[PDB]
Amino acid sequence: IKPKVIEEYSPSNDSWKSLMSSAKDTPLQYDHMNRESLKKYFNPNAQLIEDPLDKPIQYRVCEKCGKPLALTAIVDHLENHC
Amino acid sequence: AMSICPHIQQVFQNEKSKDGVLKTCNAARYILNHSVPKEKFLNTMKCGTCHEINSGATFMCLQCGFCGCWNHSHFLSHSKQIGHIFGINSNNGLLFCFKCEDYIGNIDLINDAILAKYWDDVCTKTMVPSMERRDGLSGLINMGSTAFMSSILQCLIHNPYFIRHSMSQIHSNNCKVRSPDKCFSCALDKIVHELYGALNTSTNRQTGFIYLLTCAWKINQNLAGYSQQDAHEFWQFIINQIHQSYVLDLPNNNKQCECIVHTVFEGSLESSIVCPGCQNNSKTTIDPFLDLSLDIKDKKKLYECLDSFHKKEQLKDFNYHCGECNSTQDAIKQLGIHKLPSVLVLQLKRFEHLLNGSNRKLDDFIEFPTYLNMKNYCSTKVPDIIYELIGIVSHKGTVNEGHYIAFCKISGGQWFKFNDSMVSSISQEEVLKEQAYLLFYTIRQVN
Amino acid sequence: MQIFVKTLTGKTITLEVEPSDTIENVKAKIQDKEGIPPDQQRLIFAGKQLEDGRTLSDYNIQKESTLHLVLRLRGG
Amino acid sequence: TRSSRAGLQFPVGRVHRLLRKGNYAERVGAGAPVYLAAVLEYLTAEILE
Amino acid sequence: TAQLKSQIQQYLVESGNYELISNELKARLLQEGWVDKVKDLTKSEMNINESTNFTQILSTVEPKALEMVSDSTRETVLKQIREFLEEIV
Amino acid sequence: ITIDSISNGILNNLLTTLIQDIVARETTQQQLLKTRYPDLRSYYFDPNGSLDINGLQKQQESSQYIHCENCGRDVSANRLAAHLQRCLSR
Ligand SMILES: [Zn+2]
Ligand SMILES: [Zn+2]
Ligand SMILES: [Zn+2]
Ligand SMILES: [Zn+2]
Ligand SMILES: [Zn+2]
Ligand SMILES: [Zn+2]
Ligand SMILES: [Zn+2]
Ligand SMILES: [Zn+2]
């Protein structure tokens, strides 16, 4: 293998949980919508859902008031809105 | 009567092991949402044995740092030799049991693991969607001439961003008025409530629609459904009312709106004005848009219509003095895309004006693709930019009289036709044979 | 000032207007060019339809902005 | 029927017959019995209202 | 030795060209309807075998799914990879 | 060993990875739907273009009615807007 690639770049014992640190510093990421192109061609405050029709909508319904709730919205709905 | 994997059940017989597992799954998914592409490739798609990338699915070990491939059975080998029967597929985060020879997709706790800490409460306070309501499919009866409203509402009924917004309770959480007979968004939330859930505790599921109609009557009776009207005008009117309610929800010079409409539908056009002599210049004007209106005459394909839309024009009626060559010229005008929206809405201009002051409908079939590439319209090389078709509104009749229908695509790839009260199954190819008036495209891939 | 209008065919025309000019006056000018009555005209800007009785400044409409012209397709 | 096909309660057949037989013109369009049945339904509605 | 493959792959990842390849491939298969054809194939096989077991369904889907890939996309993506390979050897 | 062969292996790797992803998503989804919903039935498809997803025809209006909450009057639904024009006119 050519020496110049190795020169400045270059069973394993390393661990994937090492990524937590990076995960701690990293903004929300998408798998197949490149971030920089989104920056160039799209607005700075766009909402984004990757592969929205992959599976049916994930949610649950309150037994008491019958509201359909997004998974991230259920808890406070249960605290002071029902 | 589909069964569930007993191997994970055994682990789940112990509460602390279960909690450890769910905590780790949640942490892992957070990492997956917060990891750049290269780290993921190098650390989750690299086989610990052969060091190949993407040797079929690569599995991330639940108990250690090892990654193992499928094609050479290297995770499989990790499972036989080290005893780890569970691995996570790095393409989708889904958990495989090598004993069942199947993924575990049917454990609600696992699918919704972020709420695991509160799961008991979640299971006591809330239920999974009912089979009947799970896709929110229901017709909206004609209450006079309200089809131009309901077809549109059906497309609104199928937008994942909108459903995430509504189900997130944002308006509900922040509304200072909290009445659906005044607030359009409250009314919408009521509709969502009726279609996906259950009001406490044949005429079914029309209450929200009636509220919306009441609000509409109160602001502009002409667009409230008694008389025939234009679906696009209703679209702009209602999204503007939604925006006004968002602004209303503020506790307090902020030109870009931060609302759901303006974070989804707003783009910007670039208009260039150039001297035909100097060909240097140019006088550039940037215009926001919430939708695009396309000419369709003498054309057969959507790309042709966008090309016409995007086509350069020489003004012959513009007073112009060039600063580089110091002379009067007939300027060149061009439209291109400066910024794209997350959801792209297209109106086909299916009409023309005659010298006698009358108008005529254009019934011309315009071919539209299942997947749309917008790369040719971006002004500044541009990477591939592809949208997925999710919606169509069609009109049958003439300019002054007709009928609107909606077509929406849901998970799995099936199309449905929404004709007032009637929701029916339709194939993609037939949808593609429809006379499109409005088209709704959602962003799918950005290169 | 000069502003632009993208017509049904996609052809763009130019109008001469003042910031204080009413939407009605602009529509009158469009009628005068195209022979289309005001009741048949729909004038679109920035995702909004422009309303009679209001001024250009009310919608933050400026010099050389482009308006998009459509008609109505009635149904229901 | 056709009352159905136009969402009308009023007998489109009866009406088309009455239009044909009452000697107003040689031929009688398809839209007119419906449009008219509609205006009639409308008005009996306003009255019963 | 077979360290070569991993080394080369590392260089490939670091250079940026992998995103371009993966993305172009995905765009082609998506646009020509292949992805959805593969979805339909999966549902059909699940219905025929009355099973959602991933391994056995995959065993029938994968060869066929591989055959269903258009020649155009195949030769174009191969051409591109080859272009990137012809760079540094 | 040649460039062509390794390239074929790379393409096979990519394709089998993508395929395994799609299939895994499909199988998990169907497993979920069948377990959550043991009695799962497909939505009705009518080749004649007449029946809805429950296999029913368009219901007869004005046979259906709505109880108007503003005045307590029941009104036939296809005249509801008319009623509201006469009802909200308070
Ligand atoms: Zn509740
Ligand atoms: Zn391990
Ligand atoms: Zn391997
Ligand atoms: Zn198992
Ligand atoms: Zn409200
Ligand atoms: Zn807004
Ligand atoms: Zn010049
Ligand atoms: Zn009332």
**What is the DSSP code string of E32-54?**
TTHHHHHHHHHHHHHHHHT---H
What are C70's two structure tokens? 């459509």
**What is the DSSP code string of B297-353?**
TT--BHHHHHHHHH--EE-SS---B-TTT-SB---EEEEEEEEB-SEEEEEEE-EEE
Q: DSSP 3-state assignment of B253?
A: coil
Q: Is the CA virtual torsion C36, C40, C45, C47 positive or negative?
A: negative
Spatial separation of the C-alpha atoms in residues B423 and F59, rounded to whole Å: 12
Element (H, E) at E61: helix E54-68
* Method used to determine the 3D structure: X-ray
Taking Cα atoms as reference points, which of B265, B262, B259 lies closest to residue B443?
B265
Q: DSSP 3-state assignment of F86?
A: helix
Residue matched to tokens 């895309």 = B337
Interface of B with F in 71-90 (CB under 8 A): 71, 89
Task: Give me the residue from F60, F62, F86 closest to D49, CB to CB.
Answer: F86
For residue A71, the enclosing domain spans 1-82
**What is the DSSP code string of B117-177?**
GGHHHHHHHEEPPPTTTTT-------SSSTHHHHHHHHHHHT-HHHHHHHHTTHHHHH-SS
DSSP 8-class letter at B375: G
- Collect all residues of chain E within an 8 Å Cβ-Cβ radius of residue B386: 27, 30-31
- List the single residue in E with minimal CA-CA distance to A33: E23
Do B149 and B225 form a contact (C-beta atoms < 8 A)? yes
Answer yes or no: do B329 and B432 share one domain.
yes
* CATH number 1.10.1670.40 given to F1-37: no
B179 alpha carbon – ligand 8 mean position (Å): 17
Domain coordinates in residue numbering, chain E: 1-89
For chain F, breaks with the C atom over 2.5 A from the next N come after none
CB within 8 Å: B103 and F43: no
Answer yes or no: do B66 and B142 share one domain.
no
- How many separate domains does chain A show? 1
Task: Give me the residue from F60, F61, F79 closest to D45, CB to CB.
Answer: F79
**Phi, psi dihedral angles at D5 (to 5 degrees):** -60, -5
Looking at domain F64-90, its CATH architecture is: 2-Layer Sandwich (3.30)
Spatial separation of the C-alpha atoms in residues D47 and B40, rounded to whole Å: 74
Element (H, E) at B57: none
Torsion angle defined by CA atoms of residues D6, D8, D11 and D17, in that order, rounded to the nearest 10 degrees:
-50
A4 to chain B, any CB pair closer than 8 A? The answer is: no
Taking Cα atoms as reference points, which of F85, D1, F59 lies closest to residue B144?
F85
Spatial separation of the C-alpha atoms in residues B346 and B293, rounded to whole Å: 6
Spatial separation of the C-alpha atoms in residues B163 and B189, rounded to whole Å: 9
Q: How far is CA E3 from CA B52, B363, C50, E10, in A?
A: 9, 63, 67, 11
What are B284's two structure tokens? 């550039």
For residue C59, the enclosing domain spans 1-76
Spatial separation of the C-alpha atoms in residues B404 and B153, rounded to whole Å: 11
DSSP 8-class letter at A34: -
Do C48 and B240 form a contact (C-beta atoms < 8 A)? yes
What are D23's two structure tokens? 């000697």
CATH code at B50? 3.30.40.10
Residue matched to tokens 């763009």 = C12
**E1 class by beta-carbon count within 10 Å (0-12 exposed, 13-18 middle, 19+ buried):** exposed
Task: Give me the residue from C4, C42, C75 closest to B404, CB to CB.
Answer: C75
Do B365 and B326 form a contact (C-beta atoms < 8 A)? no
Spatial separation of the C-alpha atoms in residues B283 and B272, rounded to whole Å: 6
**B320 class by beta-carbon count within 10 Å (0-12 exposed, 13-18 middle, 19+ buried):** middle
State CA E89 to chain mean position distance: 24
Spatial separation of the C-alpha atoms in residues B118 and B114, rounded to whole Å: 9
Do B266 and B341 form a contact (C-beta atoms < 8 A)? yes
CB within 8 Å: D45 and F82: yes
Q: Write down how long chain A is.
A: 82
Supply the Cα-derived Rg of chain D in whole angstroms. Answer: 11
Spatial separation of the C-alpha atoms in residues C70 and B332, rounded to whole Å: 24
B254 to chain C, any CB pair closer than 8 A? The answer is: no
Domain coordinates in residue numbering, chain F: 1-37, 64-90
**Phi, psi dihedral angles at B374 (to 5 degrees):** -95, 10
- List the single residue in C with minimal CA-CA distance to B319: C2
Closest-approaching ligand to the CA atom of B58:
3
Answer yes or no: do B241 and B352 share one domain.
yes
DSSP 8-class letter at C40: T
Q: DSSP 3-state assignment of B294?
A: strand
A73 alpha carbon – ligand 6 mean position (Å): 22
F84 to chain D, any CB pair closer than 8 A? The answer is: no
- Collect all residues of chain F within an 8 Å Cβ-Cβ radius of residue E50: none
- How many separate domains does chain C show? 1
Mind telling me how many Å the CA of A69 is from chain E's nearest CA? Answer: 28
Q: How far is CA E72 from CA C7, E63, E78, F7, in A?
A: 40, 18, 10, 16
CB within 8 Å: E18 and B2: no
- Given strand B126-127, what is the order of strands in its sheet? A68-70, A59-62, B126-127
Rounded to a whole number, what is the distance in angstroms from the first to the last CA of chain F? 87
F25 to chain B, any CB pair closer than 8 A? The answer is: yes
Supply the Cα-derived Rg of chain A in whole angstroms. Answer: 21
Do B143 and A46 form a contact (C-beta atoms < 8 A)? no
Spatial separation of the C-alpha atoms in residues C53 and E64, rounded to whole Å: 65
- Range list of H helices, F1-90: 3-36, 80-87
Q: What's the CATH number for E1-89?
A: 1.10.246.140
For residue B57, the enclosing domain spans 1-127
DSSP 8-class letter at E73: H
Buried b (16+ CB within 10 A) or exposed e, B60-80: bbeeeebbbbbbebbbbebbe
Do B408 and B307 form a contact (C-beta atoms < 8 A)? no
Taking Cα atoms as reference points, which of B159, B224, B203, B411 lies closest to residue B194?
B203
- Collect all residues of chain B within an 8 Å Cβ-Cβ radius of residue A13: 65
Answer yes or no: do B293 and B348 share one domain.
yes
Residues making up the binding site of A for Zn(2+): 62, 65, 77, 82
Q: Write down how long chain B is.
A: 447
Spatial separation of the C-alpha atoms in residues E47 and E45, rounded to whole Å: 5
Domain-terminating residue out of B101, B127, B153? B127
Number of H helices and E strands in chain B, helices first, is 14, 21
Apex B340 CA angle, B135 and B310, nearest 5: 120
Q: Is the CA virtual torsion B151, B153, B158, B159 positive or negative?
A: positive
Q: Is the peptide bond before C9 cis (omega within 30 degrees of 0)?
A: no
Strand B292-295 relative to strand B343-349: parallel, antiparallel, unpaired?
parallel
- How many separate domains does chain B show? 2
Q: How many CB atoms lie within 10 A of CB B146?
A: 28
Q: Write down how long chain C is.
A: 76
Domain-terminating residue out of B127, B149, B169? B127
Q: How far is CA B189 from CA B194, B270, B382, E54, F35, in A?
A: 9, 36, 39, 38, 29
CB within 8 Å: E6 and B51: yes
Resolution stated for this PDB structure, in Å: 3.8
Answer yes or no: do B64 and B137 share one domain.
no
CB within 8 Å: F62 and D9: yes
Answer yes or no: do B56 and B136 share one domain.
no
CATH code at B284? 3.90.70.10
One-letter amino acid at B315 equals L
